[PDB]
């Protein structure tokens, strides 16, 4: 969602020994403008304040607690996974650059 | 008399069930999973029909262990119907303090299914006449178990408080309130109102213990109620009670 | 009440009959300081055999893999009353398992009062505060100039209840927590615990500098025992009393039984020449009439001081202690290894809880006392 | 500005604020006899003690003043007994002081471990230990028992434990009966009662009675307490009460019934039974003579086997006799797979 509802799904297979879908619904800060996925259970999303990141990687997660990258309002993000060294992403910052 | 049919699987496994109970006088089966197919109405015939009431000290105890393994939890009403065939006879029938087994068995069972257990049984044990030391000592142990979590001591409170107050209610209730069980002032006031309606040694100590732990919860108006409630000169330890009272003022 | 005219309202306040024939209830249900939507349509008669139960998509999330449980509950349940009792009991269960979604602090009490009490301490002290502000860690100094940390874990109401206080030093730490007590209270208590051990830390730091400490390796502040090495292939394990550290400790000897004998015998002669004015080392050197080597570690970096049965140091806490009474072997072993060796062989002969046998390497008489 | 503090100063003691141990201007004997004869010669001599104890009770309403009044006196010519202790040495004040001492103490249920981690309940009870005269036992009793009835666990547990130093010789047996009264009435406090009864001065007949009154409710007892229970049974056991208790013991005991903490204390029970039977041949001989006399029933139980293995493992003089009994039992078509 835009008003910062995030939906998380996973396979649980717990307590009955049968596959049950483990849902969260997170309510994250900020009107979310754009997001993308990076290597190792990481999502880069953006609010018109800040460009923030979310680690799902550890069933899954109680809260979805999140740092910025101190980058500005990037809308329309994109990711290329390098695996050379670290991950290298491409953005359009809100001002038009 | 009533013309009720047990589920056809229970009428079928009714003698396998009668086998298994007998077995438990000498990890659980599927036969115990068929109780989920009983309504409390059919279950009521079924408790009487398994003749759970005559199980040994040993026999009952092993059993209780099995019901507590069950994965879909037993419905409020169903869980209660059970209690009254399982224990309530023996509890009422108690003369000398309950077997370590029935304490254990009851307490362990009470540990999972405490609201159905205690929502059912507490009232009648106490709404029975000729309730003696033998009966109280296990409802003493009920409240005193670590397992009886705060939330459940609160639910115990909603129940202990809805009963007519006599000496038997107070002694158990002091020991629930002895933890510092959390109170909405809604219930604390009623406890205090109810407390404030009286000659008794039990009640003396009850009031005293409230006013040390829930000093914190004592309003001006509740301290007036306590001034009212301490009026008596039959009150033993009055100096203590009024010293504690005056110390709030 | 008995009737669900009144018992329904008294147990589910937030269930409002829309239709005249009390057939559509709607509105809410309460659940662990959390109200949720509900829209619960009955048939033209009061029957739950057929009933529509629709929800918030929020409610579908929390009734994850109980869809069938509650479908059972609808068909087997007598009344709507009883259904709601169960649906509450059931939500409480679902959420207490999913208990990792909860807990908002009281900001007018907490964040400020915590900033206030840390100001009371001083800002030079604080070393760590968690981004949930749940954990913090604080620093104090000894009179010696040693850093001693304290971890705190905080509740939603810090000043009301005790914060969980975790700290390394060996005697059990006691914090007189009142709702009136603060970070400064427990900090003074922490300094009190530091100074009762002030002589103790000095005796331990002295031993750790001047002697070949063996069997705590980077010891914490919690260690009261200190396995010192002396010469090679004999050791002394030393437990010290923290309140009387300079005073005589219980001490005893590991190694070859021909090497331990004169040392024990000279300790028994010279134990009255212990004096608590000197250090532990300055009393042991004149009691046992020896010096200690300074870290035969760096020269003897591979002397194979391993079991020589299993070829490992540290088998399940145990150390190479059992040795050969021989100048030419001197090979250490473990209790478990030497026992599973000497019991397995024919030749081995046991008195009561002792085995006499042959040393594996040199085939000389070796004794094991379990 | 009270007759209490005034007449204390007259009789030759310094009554301090309450922050360090109270000084004493005269000898303790001199103080006590002077305070006695000064209250004697005062007009309204029977009525001065009411005013005396009213002044005292109003004085000791602060914690710390009272606590310093309970603590060791400073001796100028160098420690001594407390001001309340030296008052208690005076017999005419004594019953009144008991009355007061017992009246207020439930204030200190929940204020245990104040300032220097000292229990004012233990202080106020330790004012009654080794008293060289007691005027009234029965008053003292009925109040101590009513206190015991209501009070939470460790407090009363401690009173129980301290009862042997407190009580005079006339009032042993009395207490005995009413403790057996408490025994049936509460289980939790089985242990210290027992310890007490065995550290009292009583008649052995009564002890037989209570021991049976153990034995009947022994299914109701949580396991933790059993060892010291059964230790008590096997020190109360005579040479002549051997098979009696043992047959009864051997019956009532279950060890199917008890079952992670259960297993550990079962083991520790067996340690304790080992030490019992290890440690008197009286039991071993008669124990066996009580298992051979159960060759009748095919139904003799897990305990009888495990117990045999035990007496063979521990007791040495009997090895032939165990083997003899086991062989004459096992041939008979008794002990088998099941
Ligand atoms: Zn080894
Ligand atoms: Zn060798």
Swiss-Prot record, chain A:
Signal peptide: none annotated. It is found in: Nucleus. Belongs to the multisubunit FA complex composed of FANCA, FANCB, FANCC, FANCE, FANCF, FANCG, FANCL/PHF9, FANCM, FAAP24 and FAAP100. Forms a subcomplex with FANCB and FANCL. Plays a role in Fanconi anemia-associated DNA damage response network. Regulates FANCD2 monoubiquitination and the stability of the FA core complex. Induces chromosomal instability as well as hypersensitivity to DNA cross-linking agents, when repressed. This is Fanconi anemia core complex-associated protein 100.
From Swiss-Prot, chain B:
As part of the Fanconi anemia (FA) complex functions in DNA cross-links repair. Required for the nuclear accumulation of FANCC and provides a critical bridge between the FA complex and FANCD2. It is found in: Nucleus. Keywords: Disease variant, DNA damage, DNA repair, Fanconi anemia, Nucleus, Phosphoprotein, Ubl conjugation. The keyword Ubl conjugation applies. The modification Phosphothreonine is found at residue 65. The gene is FANCE. One of its GO terms (biological process) is interstrand cross-link repair. It comes from Homo sapiens (Human). Transmembrane segments: none annotated. GO terms for cellular component: centrosome; chromatin; chromosome; cytosol; Fanconi anaemia nuclear complex; nucleoplasm; nucleus. The keyword rRNA-binding does not apply. Changing residue 65 to A: Non-phosphorylatable by CHEK1, not polyubiquitinated and unable to complement the mitomycin C hypersensitivity of cells lacking FANCE. The chain holds residues 275 to 535 of 536 of the full protein. The modification Phosphoserine is found at residue 93. This is Fanconi anemia group E protein. It is linked to Fanconi anemia complementation group E: A disorder affecting all bone marrow elements and resulting in anemia, leukopenia and thrombopenia. It is associated with cardiac, renal and limb malformations, dermal pigmentary changes, and a predisposition to the development of malignancies. At the cellular level it is associated with hypersensitivity to DNA-damaging agents, chromosomal instability (increased chromosome breakage) and defective DNA repair. Phosphorylated. Phosphorylation by CHEK1 at Thr-65 and Ser-93 regulates its function in DNA cross-links repair.
Curated annotation (Swiss-Prot), chain C:
Zn(2+) 2 binds at residues 324, 329, 359, 362. The modification N-acetylalanine is found at residue 2. GO terms for cellular component: chromatin; cytosol; Fanconi anaemia nuclear complex; intracellular membrane-bounded organelle; nuclear body; nuclear envelope; nucleoplasm; nucleus. It catalyses: S-ubiquitinyl-[E2 ubiquitin-conjugating enzyme]-L-cysteine + [acceptor protein]-L-lysine = [E2 ubiquitin-conjugating enzyme]-L-cysteine + N(6)-ubiquitinyl-[acceptor protein]-L-lysine. The RING-type zinc finger domain is monoubiquitinated in the presence of UBE2T and UBE2W. One of its GO terms (molecular function) is ubiquitin protein ligase activity. GO terms for biological process: DNA damage response; DNA repair; gamete generation; interstrand cross-link repair; protein monoubiquitination; regulation of cell population proliferation. Gene3D superfamilies: RWD domain-like, Ubiquitin Conjugating Enzyme, Zinc/RING finger domain, C3HC4 (zinc finger). A zinc finger (RING-type) spans 307-363. Its EC number is 2.3.2.27. Changing residue 341 to A: Loss of interaction with UBE2T. Its main location: cytoplasm. InterPro entries: Fancl, FANCL_C, FANCL_d2, FANCL_d3, FANCL_d3_sf, FancL_WD-rpt_cont_dom, UBQ-conjugating_enzyme/RWD, Znf_RING/FYVE/PHD. Changing residue 311 to A: Loss of interaction with UBE2T. It holds the Pfam family FANCL_C. Changing residue 248 to A: Impairs interaction with FANCI and FANCD2. Changing residue 310 to A: Abolishes ubiquitin ligase activity. Zn(2+) 1 binds at residues 307, 310, 334, 337. Pathway: Protein modification; protein ubiquitination. Keywords: Acetylation, Cytoplasm, DNA damage, DNA repair, Fanconi anemia, Metal-binding, Nucleus, Transferase, Ubl conjugation, Ubl conjugation pathway, Zinc, Zinc-finger. It is found in: Cytoplasm; Nucleus. Residues 104-294 are annotated as: UBC-RWD region (URD).
Swiss-Prot record, chain D:
Highly expressed in germinal center cells of the spleen, tonsil, and reactive lymph nodes, and in the proliferating basal layer of squamous epithelium of tonsil, esophagus, oropharynx, larynx and cervix. Expressed in cytotrophoblastic cells of the placenta and exocrine cells of the pancreas (at protein level). Highly expressed in testis, where expression is restricted to maturing spermatocytes. It comes from the Eukaryota. Its main location: nucleus. One of its GO terms (cellular component) is nucleoplasm. Keywords: Cell cycle, Disease variant, DNA damage, DNA repair, Fanconi anemia, Isopeptide bond, Nucleus, Phosphoprotein, Ubl conjugation. Residues 1-239 are annotated as: Interaction with FANCE. Residues 196-282 are annotated as: Interaction with BRCA2. The keyword DNA repair applies. The modification Phosphoserine is found at residue 170. It is found in: Nucleus. Belongs to the Fanconi anemia protein FANCD2 family. This is Fanconi anemia group D2 protein. The chain holds residues 45 to 415 of 1451 of the full protein.
